[PDB]
Design a protein around this ligand. Structure first.
Ligand SMILES: O=c1ccn([C@@H]2O[C@H](CO)[C@@H](O)[C@H]2O)c(=S)[nH]1
Ligand SMILES: O=c1ccn([C@@H]2O[C@H](CO)[C@@H](O)[C@H]2O)c(=S)[nH]1
Ligand SMILES: [Mg+2]
Ligand SMILES: [Mg+2]
Lengths: 480, 480
């Protein structure tokens, strides 16, 4: 079975791998030597060297993350519905988005995050070869070549590098069945091409985050109250709370999302070439091998989150159109959506059979879940209160709607702080100076839950100094 | 009956008058020599020299405007309700407004509109004595003295100068029963004192125009959609459409509004003195005499509109509290208000007996009116669509809510343009250059009513040049 040859984690091997070994470190440190202890979240599992527990290798942990990508896809929504949905979404974006100028090579390079890695093949921090206005040395070569390919409309095969997310998790994912989330890291070449191709559209969409349902680019504090006020114009509210959103995606769906992006781009012919590269079967470097991934979402590119939100919008509209039999453009007259990758809040005036809705979703291969369990139809409520979005609870009072971080999460940020990578999470940062500057984003947030809880959080102690009690509340809710 | 002596237009004469003779001119010119003709609004009546019609003197016209001020007041709302309402409104503002720094003399002077008159006693355009950072000559003296009085917390008697509003009106107010609206022009001294005293509060309130119901300072384009989205969170919508709001006000009500402003000011002791001057019986210079006006709203001061909106809020809450029996702070949990002087939109979840509501209002001496007539309870609707605010119709679609100028009004601005004062409205501006610069605020606005009407308005002709057809629509609705 000559190349692609053999098999890794159920998937075809296309080549030898060049990725660096998976990180054994976390960026999180304890803020105090006192113990947590009980049920407290901690940084995700760090592998064989993880003093906290004996467990499998990070590569084993990663293989587990790769399983869903070889699961069979769910079904396409009915073709007539899918087409009608895409047309409606496309028409809505046509009416809302300000046509943009093409992005230059310069604009694309500047847009990139200089603190993250360049991925294949040099795997170096982008800032290393960055003069401030251009890439130099190795990265300069990789970037210029890609840009030349982009301008000639020539295809390039993206190469993603796999990683595991360093993040706080519930202890069970450490001390029980070990789990750590899969990350896809794009290559500099692809970042350049995707940014030139799609930066214009993504900018246009972002200027539009209040009027359109794709909320990528919103400030929870500043925009949340308006977005939520809009959702509240409608009778019914729900959140499908998806499991494994990315790995359950159909390239067939991603390609329709991609078609909309291409057609709404200022260089659609150049953009088309890039998008075809992005959605073609994916080369994923897992260290030993580069394996072929045909299905699911390939992430880590600039406009991934928008692409992913777009697919979500398509699927969500498909299910509602399937179930209610209402035209997608009419569904959008009678509803307000919020999408951020797999994150969603759906509000609507329509009478939606939640059994048929939950089943339509499942049929597409998605995994919606009840806040509790037993599937078992999704919930539908008549108030917005208590629904969540971007990790905040949506709250409403006489002044308006807002997003509020729960106390658990606020408490959590008190126990942990970011700093350089190290091996033992329980170590405290030794020169425990200042959570900036800012990070009194808690207090107000903490705040928000009332004077009683706010007071106890005012043990923002260090070590200058006060107060700032305690109509920080006024400042957070209304501001400036 | 020694001073105050005799009587003018039903009101006591306190002194001889110093006001300049009422204007005989309009600032409006026709945009074309073609006739209007039928039913077309025109500039209000210009008096004896008005070639269009033979009519009474402007002073007679003004006397008619003064009648309502000697009408008996309506009744105070029940004292327990009034107190509870004031407390609730005060508490709401306490929770929302950012405490402010006191305004300096400099800040107060700069805030004044330099293009309008200084009123009593010099009656000159403010810009005449304005170096750019200070008042000089006569105005400098008047301003410094007032500021000294303000700082010593000493009282001064305001002197208002009466005028008649130059504005487009329906022809019946010209060719039928002649009518022209009364204006009160404050004196520079009082403007200084009111601005130092109340500029801080008014700034604070204005920063708050989306979260609080007093909408003074809103941009219809930018803020309208959010304000309206909020109103739309509620089941029922209404507009009391008041006749003669200002002249029907009770000083007793204005004084409670004033108390809130004083208490929320950074120099409440100094502010109190000013507010007592502002609400004490009013000296109104009508030319021949200064007459005493005890009742109704005395306008023309800086923060009049906020004071007036505040009273409106008090009265509106009183009526709803009287009728529903719900606590005012609870009424505000279940409702969204918009007030701008006499202009209002009231939205609420509560079940309001519209007969009892209309009667409560009338009892306070207000004159609510049905969009048609026959009083006859006010209307209550279950959609926002079709309600008006700041002269715009509130419109909703799949993208959101917005304010839209009606076609009549758009047509109107095509027939007339502003320019220097002249005697014959039908004259066209002879060097018919450019409606700026801008004023393509029509087109988009005109727009908004669809391509069909938008096309016909594109006779924006002059005389360079195009187009700008015709997703100006996109630009007006979403912008920037
Ligand atoms: O709230 C979020 C934020 C990001 N992502 C997606 O998760 C992947 C990165 O972890 C990318 O595909 C993102 O679009 C999701 S699914 N939900
Ligand atoms: O929409 C408006 C705008 C202004 N005013 C008031 O009208 C007077 C000036 O004509 C002042 O008392 C203003 O507060 C009113 S009543 N409604
Ligand atoms: Mg959600
Ligand atoms: Mg109104």
């Amino acid at each position: 079975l000559p190349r692609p040859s053999g098999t890794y984690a159920g998937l075809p091997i296309a080549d030898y791998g060049d990725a660096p070994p998976l990180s054994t470190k976390t960026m999180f440190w304890r803020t105090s030597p006192e113990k947590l202890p009980p049920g407290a979240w901690e940084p995700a599992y760090l592998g064989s060297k993880d003093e906290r527990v004996d467990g499998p290798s990070l590569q084993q942990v990663m293989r587990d993350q790769l399983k869903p990508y070889s699961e069979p896809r769910g079904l396409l929504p009915p073709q007539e519905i899918l087409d009608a949905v895409c047309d409606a979404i496309e028409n809505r974006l046509e009416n809302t988005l300000e046509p943009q100028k093409p992005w230059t090579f310069k604009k694309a390079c500047e847009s990139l995050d200089k603190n993250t890695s360049s991925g294949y093949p040099y795997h170096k921090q982008k800032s290393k070869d960055w003069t401030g206005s251009a890439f130099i040395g190795d990265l300069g070569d990789q970037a210029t070549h890609a840009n030349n390919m982009y301008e000639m409309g020539k295809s390039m095969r993206p190469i993603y590098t796999a990683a595991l997310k360093d993040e706080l998790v519930k202890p069970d994912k450490i001390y029980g069945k070990i789990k750590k989330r899969l990350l896809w890291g794009s290559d500099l070449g692809t970042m350049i091409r995707a940014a030139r191709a799609f930066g214009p559209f993504c900018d246009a969409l972002k200027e539009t985050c209040i009027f359109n349902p794709i909320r990528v680019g919103m400030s929870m504090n500043e925009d949340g109250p308006f977005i939520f006020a809009r959702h509240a114009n409608f009778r019914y509210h729900m959140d499908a709370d998806y499991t494994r959103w990315d790995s359950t995606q159909q390239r067939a769906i991603l390609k329709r999302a991609g078609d909309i992006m291409v057609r709404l781009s200022p260089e659609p012919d150049l953009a088309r070439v890039v998008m075809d590269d992005l959605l073609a079967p994916s080369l994923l470097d897992v260290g030993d091998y580069k394996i072929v991934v045909e299905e699911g979402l390939p992430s880590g590119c600039p406009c991934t989150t928008q692409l992913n939100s777009l697919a979500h919008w398509i699927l969500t509209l498909c299910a509602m159109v399937e179930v209610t039999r209402v035209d997608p453009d009419i569904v959008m007259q009678e509803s307000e959506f919020s999408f951020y990758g797999d994150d969603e809040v759906v509000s609507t005036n329509l009478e939606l059979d939640m059994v048929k809705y939950t089943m339509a979703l499942r049929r597409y291969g998605l995994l919606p879940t009840r806040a509790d369990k037993e599937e078992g139809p999704l919930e539908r409520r008549q108030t917005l209160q208590g629904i969540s979005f971007l990790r905040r609870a949506i709250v409403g009072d006489q002044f308006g709607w807002y997003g509020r971080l729960d106390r658990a999460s606020i408490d959590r940020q008190l126990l942990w702080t970011k700093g350089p990578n190290h091996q033992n999470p329980f170590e405290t940062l030794p020169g425990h100076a200042q959570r900036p500057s800012q990070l009194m984003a808690l207090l107000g947030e903490a705040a928000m839950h009332g004077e009683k809880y706010y007071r106890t959080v005012a043990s923002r102690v260090s070590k200058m100094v006060v107060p700032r009690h305690r109509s920080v509340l006024r400042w957070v809710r209304f501001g400036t």
